[PDB]
Amino acid sequence: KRIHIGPGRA
Amino acid sequence: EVQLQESGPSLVKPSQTLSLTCSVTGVSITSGYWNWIRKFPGNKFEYMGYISKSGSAYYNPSLKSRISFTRDTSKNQFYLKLNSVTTEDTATYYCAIDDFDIWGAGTTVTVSSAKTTPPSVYPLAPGSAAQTNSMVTLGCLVKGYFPEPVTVTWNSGSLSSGVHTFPAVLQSDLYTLSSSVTVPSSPRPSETVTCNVAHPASSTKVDKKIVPRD
Amino acid sequence: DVVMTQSPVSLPVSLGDQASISCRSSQSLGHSSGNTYLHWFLQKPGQSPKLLIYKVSNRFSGVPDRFSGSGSGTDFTFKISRVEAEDLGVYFCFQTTHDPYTFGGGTKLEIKRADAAPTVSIFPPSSEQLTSGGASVVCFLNNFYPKDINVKWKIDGSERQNGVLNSWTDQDSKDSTYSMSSTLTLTKDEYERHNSYTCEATHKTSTSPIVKSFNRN
């Protein structure tokens, strides 16, 4: 899963 | 395990508003941020904006006056609303997960003043002459319809290999399309072959059986 | 508005060969590769975009090692060591460093396989289209290569280039061929006025035309 490139990065 | 499904009208009149829905399955919409993307004919994407974990919304500047997002936890859906659409808003709309690693199948939207017209699907069989090898080709013609798209399947989806579905061509403000499937000479006409054509815009569904010519 | 300039637009390549796509941004997208949000997606014919490479070089889960990724400041290159038949489709670069997120124009990747002749088959108008005023004669030219191909239509010997529509499928992701459908439309009355309908497909793989026809009546 979670790669962190989306609109909710923070 | 996440699934995304976009739905809406495949036809809108210029100046009216577009209203899309993204059905999320496998995880509650409140777990993260979701994406809205459109793709104009000719492979040209344009990020439209996003809905936050809290219902907040960011709109791409090229749209924030006509565009508007909302959500509904109970139905686990979030929506998109576009006002005063023009033929320039004609595109396939998509919703994807936060990290863009899962998109929906996308829903195509046509902005046009033309009216909706269901297709006339005709069976395409050989005239005592598709032949005697080990393979035989059968066809199915979907004519005079509007707007896009249509989905053609053979034997409810069982016949997958040897299936060629050609792009629709526009003429007289009406679309026409065809599909062929090549199967062994033994399974036909011994067994039955049928093309399942469905047209969203008209909520039409036809199933023509390819019967040999008399 | 970060402008993503992608080139080339079309990339013809032979199976097993190396493929390279280039993407350039008008703005810096970061300075580290772990802060540079430039990604690569692939869109197969009739499917949604598939994330193949994120953060410039990080290969996503389930993506073969044939797919590579590198860049710097504004320059980014996407590579595919051994091009396979399933790599067919359009590749897109995309950034999420700045709002609004912008994409590259896309690169259509096509496979260069061996020449193949078309399998032609002709079909008379349906018994039901006729009872509905019109008559369409279809002819399929399946699994050939290259894409370029001409279709001739003869009605009782005379050529009819008026009222014909042609459509090519996307390259096959298995045999890498193209297929084409040719439709000659007429009214029922003219259709009835003639007997023989011919469909002639001339293709590079032959000097002689492949001819398929039928005798209405």
Side-chain angles (χ1 to χ4, degrees):
Chain A
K1 288 171 188 69
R2 309 228 251 206
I3 99 171
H4 306 142
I5 71 182
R9 216 173 289 153
Chain B
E1 314 190 333
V2 181
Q3 310 256 306
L4 290 120
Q5 172 208 78
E6 315 94 318
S7 68
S10 48
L11 181 53
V12 184
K13 285 173 177 170
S15 173
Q16 295 182 171
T17 77
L18 181 60
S19 299
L20 307 176
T21 294
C22 180
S23 291
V24 197
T25 289
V27 70
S28 187
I29 184 190
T30 45
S31 51
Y33 290 52
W34 306 84
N35 297 296
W36 272 124
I37 303 107
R38 83 207 306 199
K39 185 195 64 178
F40 312 105
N43 294 310
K44 188 197 176 184
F45 294 82
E46 180 189 69
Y47 187 67
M48 299 181 82
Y50 65 74
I51 179 75
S52 69
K53 214 191 168 186
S54 66
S56 306
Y58 163 80
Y59 303 120
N60 179 318
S62 65
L63 302 170
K64 52 180 168 185
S65 47
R66 300 189 299 136
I67 198 61
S68 172
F69 299 161
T70 47
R71 69 168 184 182
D72 186 315
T73 51
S74 295
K75 302 178 290 187
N76 201 49
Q77 316 176 312
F78 57 88
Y79 322 84
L80 176 159
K81 178 182 175 182
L82 191 61
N83 304 156
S84 305
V85 307
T86 84
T87 69
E88 304 315 309
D89 290 304
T90 291
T92 294
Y93 291 67
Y94 291 102
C95 49
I97 57 164
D98 198 52
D99 294 326
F100 304 93
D101 54 290
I102 299 168
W103 298 49
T107 175
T108 68
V109 172
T110 300
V111 174
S112 176
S113 68
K115 70 174 182 68
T116 299
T117 314
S120 293
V121 4
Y122 309 111
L124 295 176
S128 302
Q131 320 119 322
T132 59
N133 286 305
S134 49
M135 298 282 111
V136 56
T137 300
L138 308 175
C140 188
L141 183 66
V142 192
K143 186 191 187 73
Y145 75 80
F146 184 97
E148 289 266 59
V150 278
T151 46
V152 175
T153 67
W154 292 88
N155 288 329
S156 308
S158 296
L159 290 179
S160 314
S161 67
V163 175
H164 285 128
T165 296
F166 313 79
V169 175
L170 190 46
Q171 181 192 303
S172 303
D173 307 50
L174 278 193
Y175 289 110
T176 294
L177 161 168
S178 63
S179 177
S180 65
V181 58
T182 299
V183 306
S185 302
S186 52
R188 167 97 187 357
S190 298
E191 297 166 55
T192 77
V193 177
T194 313
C195 41
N196 317 93
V197 187
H199 185 215
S202 59
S203 303
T204 274
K205 178 65 177 185
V206 176
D207 300 295
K208 275 295 181 296
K209 172 189 174 178
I210 312 301
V211 186
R213 294 177 176 283
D214 67 62
Chain C
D1 233 49
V2 188
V3 176
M4 301 275 61
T5 300
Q6 204 181 314
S7 49
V9 172
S10 290
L11 185 66
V13 295
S14 305
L15 293 166
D17 278 13
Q18 180 191 179
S20 286
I21 312 305
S22 170
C23 183
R24 292 180 178 262
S25 63
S26 53
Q27 297 181 46
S28 170
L29 306 180
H31 302 73
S32 70
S33 185
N35 185 177
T36 309
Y37 298 89
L38 185 286
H39 330 294
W40 302 88
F41 301 71
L42 187 179
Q43 186 165 54
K44 291 286 182 47
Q47 308 181 175
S48 293
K50 289 302 196 301
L51 177 59
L52 293 186
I53 298 189
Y54 66 104
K55 293 288 223 298
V56 177
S57 56
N58 295 293
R59 195 154 61 213
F60 197 37
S61 184
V63 191
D65 48 56
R66 298 204 320 295
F67 297 61
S68 179
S70 59
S72 50
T74 72
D75 275 52
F76 304 95
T77 307
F78 174 73
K79 298 193 173 185
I80 300 177
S81 44
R82 301 166 292 287
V83 174
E84 282 171 37
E86 314 290 312
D87 298 325
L88 172 62
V90 186
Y91 291 74
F92 296 84
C93 46
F94 161 67
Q95 60 88 31
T96 58
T97 300
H98 299 290
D99 294 300
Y101 304 159
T102 24
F103 302 66
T107 287
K108 187 172 188 178
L109 178 156
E110 29 203 298
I111 313 303
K112 290 165 62 183
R113 55 102 79 203
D115 300 324
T119 303
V120 191
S121 53
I122 187 169
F123 307 78
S126 55
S127 187
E128 59 181 5
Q129 168 179 36
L130 292 174
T131 56
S132 295
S136 296
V137 181
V138 180
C139 185
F140 297 123
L141 294 77
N142 300 311
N143 313 74
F144 57 95
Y145 191 88
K147 192 175 186 172
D148 197 70
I149 192 173
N150 289 297
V151 183
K152 222 164 190 163
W153 284 93
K154 286 173 173 280
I155 298 176
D156 280 323
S158 175
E159 156 70 75
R160 176 59 181 270
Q161 60 182 358
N162 328 281
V164 174
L165 283 174
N166 303 318
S167 195
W168 287 247
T169 42
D170 294 286
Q171 252 194 302
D172 186 80
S173 48
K174 294 292 183 173
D175 66 6
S176 291
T177 62
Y178 289 93
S179 286
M180 191 226 121
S181 181
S182 190
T183 309
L184 164 59
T185 288
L186 309 165
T187 46
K188 184 188 190 177
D189 284 346
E190 171 180 40
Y191 176 60
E192 275 168 35
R193 302 161 207 165
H194 302 289
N195 287 62
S196 185
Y197 295 73
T198 307
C199 174
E200 286 178 39
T202 61
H203 185 273
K204 170 188 179 185
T205 57
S206 172
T207 55
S208 309
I210 297 174
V211 185
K212 261 54 172 54
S213 64
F214 73 79
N215 242 128
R216 180 187 73 48
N217 100 338

Short mmCIF file of all heavy atoms in Angstrom, two decimals, chain A residues 5, chain B residues 45 94 96 99-105, chain C residues 39-54 60-63 67 78 86 88 90-94 103:
data_model
loop_
_atom_site.label_atom_id
_atom_site.label_comp_id
_atom_site.label_asym_id
_atom_site.label_seq_id
_atom_site.Cartn_x
_atom_site.Cartn_y
_atom_site.Cartn_z
N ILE A 5 1.33 10.21 -2.55
CA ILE A 5 1.52 11.09 -3.70
C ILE A 5 0.19 11.78 -3.94
O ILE A 5 0.08 12.64 -4.81
CB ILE A 5 1.91 10.31 -5.00
CG1 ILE A 5 0.72 9.50 -5.53
CG2 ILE A 5 3.08 9.38 -4.73
CD1 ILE A 5 1.06 8.70 -6.77
N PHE B 45 -5.50 14.71 -20.41
CA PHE B 45 -6.07 14.75 -19.07
C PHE B 45 -6.03 16.15 -18.45
O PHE B 45 -5.21 17.01 -18.81
CB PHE B 45 -5.35 13.78 -18.14
CG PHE B 45 -5.53 12.33 -18.51
CD1 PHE B 45 -4.75 11.74 -19.50
CD2 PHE B 45 -6.48 11.55 -17.85
CE1 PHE B 45 -4.91 10.40 -19.84
CE2 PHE B 45 -6.65 10.20 -18.18
CZ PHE B 45 -5.86 9.63 -19.17
N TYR B 94 -13.32 10.60 -14.60
CA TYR B 94 -12.74 9.60 -13.72
C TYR B 94 -12.61 10.03 -12.26
O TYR B 94 -12.42 11.21 -11.96
CB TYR B 94 -11.32 9.28 -14.19
CG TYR B 94 -11.18 8.53 -15.49
CD1 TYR B 94 -10.83 9.20 -16.67
CD2 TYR B 94 -11.33 7.15 -15.54
CE1 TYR B 94 -10.61 8.49 -17.86
CE2 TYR B 94 -11.11 6.44 -16.72
CZ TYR B 94 -10.76 7.11 -17.87
OH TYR B 94 -10.51 6.40 -19.02
N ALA B 96 -10.37 8.77 -8.87
CA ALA B 96 -9.27 7.89 -8.47
C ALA B 96 -8.98 8.06 -6.99
O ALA B 96 -9.35 9.08 -6.39
CB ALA B 96 -8.02 8.22 -9.28
N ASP B 99 -3.73 8.33 -3.84
CA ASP B 99 -2.44 8.14 -4.51
C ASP B 99 -2.52 7.76 -6.00
O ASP B 99 -1.53 7.33 -6.58
CB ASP B 99 -1.60 7.09 -3.77
CG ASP B 99 -1.17 7.54 -2.38
OD1 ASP B 99 -0.92 8.75 -2.20
OD2 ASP B 99 -1.05 6.69 -1.47
N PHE B 100 -3.69 7.92 -6.60
CA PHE B 100 -3.90 7.61 -8.03
C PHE B 100 -3.56 6.20 -8.47
O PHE B 100 -3.34 5.97 -9.66
CB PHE B 100 -3.10 8.57 -8.93
CG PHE B 100 -3.39 10.03 -8.70
CD1 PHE B 100 -2.61 10.77 -7.82
CD2 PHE B 100 -4.45 10.66 -9.35
CE1 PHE B 100 -2.87 12.12 -7.59
CE2 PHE B 100 -4.73 12.01 -9.13
CZ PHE B 100 -3.93 12.74 -8.25
N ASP B 101 -3.52 5.24 -7.54
CA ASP B 101 -3.20 3.87 -7.92
C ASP B 101 -4.43 3.01 -8.19
O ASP B 101 -4.32 1.82 -8.45
CB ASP B 101 -2.31 3.19 -6.86
CG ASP B 101 -2.89 3.26 -5.46
OD1 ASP B 101 -2.92 4.37 -4.88
OD2 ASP B 101 -3.32 2.20 -4.93
N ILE B 102 -5.60 3.63 -8.13
CA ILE B 102 -6.87 2.94 -8.38
C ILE B 102 -7.88 3.97 -8.89
O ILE B 102 -8.27 4.89 -8.18
CB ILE B 102 -7.45 2.28 -7.10
CG1 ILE B 102 -6.48 1.23 -6.56
CG2 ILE B 102 -8.78 1.60 -7.41
CD1 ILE B 102 -6.84 0.75 -5.17
N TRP B 103 -8.30 3.78 -10.13
CA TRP B 103 -9.26 4.66 -10.78
C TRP B 103 -10.54 3.88 -11.04
O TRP B 103 -10.58 2.67 -10.86
CB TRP B 103 -8.71 5.14 -12.12
CG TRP B 103 -7.46 5.95 -12.07
CD1 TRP B 103 -6.32 5.65 -11.39
CD2 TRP B 103 -7.20 7.15 -12.79
NE1 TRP B 103 -5.35 6.58 -11.65
CE2 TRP B 103 -5.86 7.52 -12.51
CE3 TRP B 103 -7.95 7.96 -13.65
CZ2 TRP B 103 -5.26 8.66 -13.06
CZ3 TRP B 103 -7.36 9.08 -14.21
CH2 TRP B 103 -6.03 9.42 -13.91
N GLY B 104 -11.58 4.59 -11.46
CA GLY B 104 -12.82 3.94 -11.80
C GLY B 104 -12.70 3.66 -13.29
O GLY B 104 -11.72 4.07 -13.92
N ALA B 105 -13.68 2.98 -13.87
CA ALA B 105 -13.65 2.66 -15.29
C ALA B 105 -13.86 3.93 -16.12
O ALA B 105 -13.56 3.95 -17.33
CB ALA B 105 -14.74 1.65 -15.61
N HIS C 39 5.38 11.28 -11.90
CA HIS C 39 5.05 9.87 -12.01
C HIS C 39 4.73 9.46 -13.43
O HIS C 39 4.50 10.31 -14.29
CB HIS C 39 3.84 9.56 -11.14
CG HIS C 39 3.73 10.44 -9.94
ND1 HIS C 39 4.66 10.41 -8.92
CD2 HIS C 39 2.82 11.38 -9.60
CE1 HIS C 39 4.31 11.30 -8.00
NE2 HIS C 39 3.20 11.90 -8.39
N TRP C 40 4.72 8.15 -13.66
CA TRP C 40 4.41 7.61 -14.97
C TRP C 40 3.27 6.60 -14.90
O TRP C 40 3.29 5.69 -14.07
CB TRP C 40 5.64 6.97 -15.60
CG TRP C 40 6.79 7.91 -15.74
CD1 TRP C 40 7.75 8.17 -14.81
CD2 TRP C 40 7.10 8.73 -16.88
NE1 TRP C 40 8.65 9.10 -15.30
CE2 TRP C 40 8.26 9.46 -16.56
CE3 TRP C 40 6.50 8.91 -18.13
CZ2 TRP C 40 8.85 10.36 -17.46
CZ3 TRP C 40 7.08 9.81 -19.03
CH2 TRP C 40 8.24 10.52 -18.68
N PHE C 41 2.29 6.79 -15.78
CA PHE C 41 1.12 5.92 -15.89
C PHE C 41 1.09 5.37 -17.30
O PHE C 41 1.69 5.94 -18.21
CB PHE C 41 -0.19 6.71 -15.70
CG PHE C 41 -0.31 7.41 -14.37
CD1 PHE C 41 0.47 8.52 -14.07
CD2 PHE C 41 -1.22 6.95 -13.41
CE1 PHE C 41 0.35 9.17 -12.84
CE2 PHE C 41 -1.35 7.59 -12.18
CZ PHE C 41 -0.56 8.70 -11.89
N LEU C 42 0.37 4.27 -17.48
CA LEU C 42 0.20 3.63 -18.78
C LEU C 42 -1.30 3.45 -18.95
O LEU C 42 -1.99 3.07 -18.00
CB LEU C 42 0.88 2.26 -18.79
CG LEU C 42 0.99 1.44 -20.08
CD1 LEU C 42 1.72 0.15 -19.78
CD2 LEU C 42 -0.37 1.13 -20.65
N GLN C 43 -1.82 3.75 -20.14
CA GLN C 43 -3.25 3.54 -20.36
C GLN C 43 -3.46 2.62 -21.54
O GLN C 43 -3.19 2.97 -22.68
CB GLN C 43 -4.00 4.86 -20.59
CG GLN C 43 -5.52 4.65 -20.67
CD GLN C 43 -6.33 5.94 -20.53
OE1 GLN C 43 -6.10 6.92 -21.26
NE2 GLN C 43 -7.29 5.95 -19.60
N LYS C 44 -3.93 1.41 -21.23
CA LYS C 44 -4.20 0.38 -22.22
C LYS C 44 -5.49 0.70 -22.93
O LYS C 44 -6.36 1.36 -22.38
CB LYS C 44 -4.33 -0.97 -21.55
CG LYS C 44 -3.05 -1.50 -20.99
CD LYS C 44 -2.16 -1.99 -22.10
CE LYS C 44 -0.90 -2.57 -21.50
NZ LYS C 44 -1.24 -3.50 -20.38
N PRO C 45 -5.64 0.21 -24.17
CA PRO C 45 -6.85 0.44 -24.96
C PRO C 45 -8.09 -0.05 -24.21
O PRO C 45 -8.20 -1.23 -23.88
CB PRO C 45 -6.59 -0.37 -26.22
CG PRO C 45 -5.09 -0.32 -26.35
CD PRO C 45 -4.65 -0.57 -24.93
N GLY C 46 -9.01 0.87 -23.92
CA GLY C 46 -10.24 0.52 -23.22
C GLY C 46 -10.14 0.25 -21.72
O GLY C 46 -11.00 -0.43 -21.16
N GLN C 47 -9.11 0.78 -21.07
CA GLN C 47 -8.92 0.58 -19.63
C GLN C 47 -8.60 1.91 -18.95
O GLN C 47 -8.42 2.94 -19.61
CB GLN C 47 -7.76 -0.37 -19.38
CG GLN C 47 -7.83 -1.67 -20.14
CD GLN C 47 -6.66 -2.55 -19.81
OE1 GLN C 47 -6.58 -3.69 -20.25
NE2 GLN C 47 -5.73 -2.03 -19.03
N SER C 48 -8.52 1.88 -17.63
CA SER C 48 -8.20 3.08 -16.87
C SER C 48 -6.69 3.20 -16.74
O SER C 48 -5.96 2.25 -17.02
CB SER C 48 -8.83 3.01 -15.49
OG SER C 48 -10.24 3.07 -15.58
N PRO C 49 -6.21 4.38 -16.32
CA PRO C 49 -4.77 4.58 -16.17
C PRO C 49 -4.16 3.70 -15.07
O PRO C 49 -4.72 3.56 -13.98
CB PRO C 49 -4.66 6.07 -15.83
CG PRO C 49 -5.86 6.65 -16.52
CD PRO C 49 -6.94 5.65 -16.21
N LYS C 50 -3.01 3.10 -15.38
CA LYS C 50 -2.31 2.26 -14.42
C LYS C 50 -1.00 2.94 -14.02
O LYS C 50 -0.18 3.29 -14.87
CB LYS C 50 -2.04 0.87 -15.02
CG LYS C 50 -3.29 0.00 -15.19
CD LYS C 50 -4.01 -0.22 -13.85
CE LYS C 50 -5.00 -1.38 -13.89
NZ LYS C 50 -6.05 -1.22 -14.92
N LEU C 51 -0.82 3.14 -12.72
CA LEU C 51 0.38 3.76 -12.17
C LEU C 51 1.52 2.77 -12.30
O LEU C 51 1.45 1.65 -11.78
CB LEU C 51 0.14 4.09 -10.71
CG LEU C 51 1.24 4.69 -9.84
CD1 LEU C 51 1.70 6.01 -10.43
CD2 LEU C 51 0.68 4.89 -8.43
N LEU C 52 2.58 3.16 -13.00
CA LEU C 52 3.72 2.27 -13.17
C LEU C 52 4.92 2.75 -12.39
O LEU C 52 5.64 1.94 -11.81
CB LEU C 52 4.09 2.17 -14.64
CG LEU C 52 3.12 1.48 -15.60
CD1 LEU C 52 3.79 1.38 -16.99
CD2 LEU C 52 2.76 0.09 -15.08
N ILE C 53 5.14 4.06 -12.40
CA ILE C 53 6.29 4.64 -11.72
C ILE C 53 5.95 5.94 -10.98
O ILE C 53 5.38 6.86 -11.56
CB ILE C 53 7.42 4.91 -12.74
CG1 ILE C 53 7.87 3.58 -13.34
CG2 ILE C 53 8.57 5.65 -12.09
CD1 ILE C 53 9.09 3.66 -14.18
N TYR C 54 6.31 6.00 -9.69
CA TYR C 54 6.06 7.19 -8.87
C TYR C 54 7.34 7.73 -8.24
O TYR C 54 8.27 6.99 -7.95
CB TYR C 54 5.05 6.91 -7.76
CG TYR C 54 5.52 5.92 -6.72
CD1 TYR C 54 5.94 6.35 -5.45
CD2 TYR C 54 5.54 4.55 -6.98
CE1 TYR C 54 6.35 5.44 -4.48
CE2 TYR C 54 5.95 3.63 -6.02
CZ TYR C 54 6.35 4.08 -4.77
OH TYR C 54 6.72 3.16 -3.81
N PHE C 60 6.20 0.92 -8.91
CA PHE C 60 5.05 0.49 -8.14
C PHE C 60 5.00 -1.04 -8.01
O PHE C 60 5.74 -1.75 -8.70
CB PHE C 60 3.76 1.03 -8.79
CG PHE C 60 2.56 1.00 -7.90
CD1 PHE C 60 2.67 1.27 -6.54
CD2 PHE C 60 1.30 0.74 -8.41
CE1 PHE C 60 1.55 1.28 -5.72
CE2 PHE C 60 0.18 0.75 -7.60
CZ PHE C 60 0.31 1.02 -6.25
N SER C 61 4.13 -1.53 -7.13
CA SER C 61 4.00 -2.97 -6.89
C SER C 61 3.38 -3.70 -8.07
O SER C 61 2.33 -3.31 -8.57
CB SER C 61 3.15 -3.22 -5.64
OG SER C 61 3.09 -4.62 -5.34
N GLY C 62 4.05 -4.76 -8.50
CA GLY C 62 3.55 -5.54 -9.61
C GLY C 62 4.04 -5.08 -10.96
O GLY C 62 3.60 -5.59 -12.00
N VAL C 63 4.94 -4.11 -10.96
CA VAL C 63 5.48 -3.60 -12.21
C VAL C 63 6.84 -4.25 -12.42
O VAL C 63 7.73 -4.15 -11.57
CB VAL C 63 5.63 -2.08 -12.15
CG1 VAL C 63 5.93 -1.53 -13.53
CG2 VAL C 63 4.37 -1.46 -11.61
N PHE C 67 10.67 -1.83 -16.54
CA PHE C 67 10.27 -0.43 -16.41
C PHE C 67 11.21 0.32 -15.46
O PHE C 67 11.37 -0.06 -14.30
CB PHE C 67 8.81 -0.35 -15.94
CG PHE C 67 7.84 -0.95 -16.91
CD1 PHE C 67 7.91 -2.30 -17.24
CD2 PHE C 67 6.89 -0.16 -17.54
CE1 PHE C 67 7.05 -2.85 -18.20
CE2 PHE C 67 6.03 -0.70 -18.51
CZ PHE C 67 6.11 -2.05 -18.84
N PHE C 78 11.67 8.01 -19.02
CA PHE C 78 11.03 6.75 -18.67
C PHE C 78 11.58 5.75 -19.67
O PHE C 78 11.60 6.02 -20.87
CB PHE C 78 9.51 6.87 -18.83
CG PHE C 78 8.77 5.59 -18.63
CD1 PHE C 78 8.62 5.05 -17.36
CD2 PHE C 78 8.22 4.91 -19.71
CE1 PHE C 78 7.92 3.86 -17.17
CE2 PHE C 78 7.53 3.72 -19.53
CZ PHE C 78 7.38 3.20 -18.26
N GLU C 86 2.64 -6.71 -24.50
CA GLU C 86 1.64 -6.18 -23.58
C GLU C 86 1.94 -4.75 -23.13
O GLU C 86 1.17 -4.18 -22.36
CB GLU C 86 1.53 -7.08 -22.34
CG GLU C 86 1.45 -8.59 -22.62
CD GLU C 86 0.15 -9.03 -23.27
OE1 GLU C 86 -0.94 -8.63 -22.80
OE2 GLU C 86 0.20 -9.80 -24.26
N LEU C 88 1.99 -2.33 -25.09
CA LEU C 88 1.21 -1.55 -26.03
C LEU C 88 0.23 -0.62 -25.30
O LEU C 88 -0.47 -1.03 -24.37
CB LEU C 88 0.45 -2.53 -26.92
CG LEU C 88 -0.59 -2.00 -27.89
CD1 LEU C 88 0.05 -1.06 -28.91
CD2 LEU C 88 -1.24 -3.19 -28.57
N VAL C 90 -0.69 3.90 -24.32
CA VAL C 90 -0.18 5.27 -24.23
C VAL C 90 0.40 5.58 -22.85
O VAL C 90 -0.26 5.35 -21.83
CB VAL C 90 -1.30 6.29 -24.55
CG1 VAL C 90 -0.73 7.70 -24.60
CG2 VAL C 90 -1.97 5.94 -25.86
N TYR C 91 1.62 6.10 -22.82
CA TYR C 91 2.29 6.45 -21.56
C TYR C 91 2.17 7.94 -21.23
O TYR C 91 2.34 8.79 -22.09
CB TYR C 91 3.76 6.05 -21.62
CG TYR C 91 3.93 4.55 -21.61
CD1 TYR C 91 3.64 3.79 -22.74
CD2 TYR C 91 4.30 3.88 -20.45
CE1 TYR C 91 3.71 2.40 -22.70
CE2 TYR C 91 4.36 2.49 -20.40
CZ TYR C 91 4.06 1.76 -21.53
OH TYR C 91 4.10 0.39 -21.48
N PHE C 92 1.86 8.23 -19.96
CA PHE C 92 1.68 9.61 -19.51
C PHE C 92 2.54 9.98 -18.32
O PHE C 92 2.67 9.20 -17.38
CB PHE C 92 0.24 9.87 -19.08
CG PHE C 92 -0.76 9.74 -20.18
CD1 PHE C 92 -1.28 8.50 -20.53
CD2 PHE C 92 -1.20 10.88 -20.86
CE1 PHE C 92 -2.23 8.39 -21.55
CE2 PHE C 92 -2.15 10.78 -21.87
CZ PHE C 92 -2.66 9.53 -22.22
N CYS C 93 3.14 11.17 -18.36
CA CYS C 93 3.89 11.63 -17.20
C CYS C 93 2.88 12.50 -16.50
O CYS C 93 1.94 12.97 -17.13
CB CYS C 93 5.16 12.40 -17.56
SG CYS C 93 5.15 13.69 -18.83
N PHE C 94 3.07 12.72 -15.21
CA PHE C 94 2.10 13.46 -14.43
C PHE C 94 2.77 13.92 -13.15
O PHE C 94 3.54 13.17 -12.55
CB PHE C 94 0.92 12.50 -14.15
CG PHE C 94 0.03 12.90 -13.02
CD1 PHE C 94 -0.77 14.04 -13.09
CD2 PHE C 94 -0.10 12.07 -11.90
CE1 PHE C 94 -1.69 14.34 -12.07
CE2 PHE C 94 -1.00 12.35 -10.88
CZ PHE C 94 -1.80 13.49 -10.96
N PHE C 103 -0.66 16.97 -16.36
CA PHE C 103 -0.18 15.78 -17.09
C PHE C 103 0.61 16.14 -18.35
O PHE C 103 0.59 17.29 -18.80
CB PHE C 103 -1.35 14.90 -17.54
CG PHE C 103 -2.23 14.41 -16.43
CD1 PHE C 103 -2.99 15.30 -15.68
CD2 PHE C 103 -2.33 13.05 -16.16
CE1 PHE C 103 -3.84 14.84 -14.68
CE2 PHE C 103 -3.18 12.58 -15.15
CZ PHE C 103 -3.93 13.47 -14.42
#
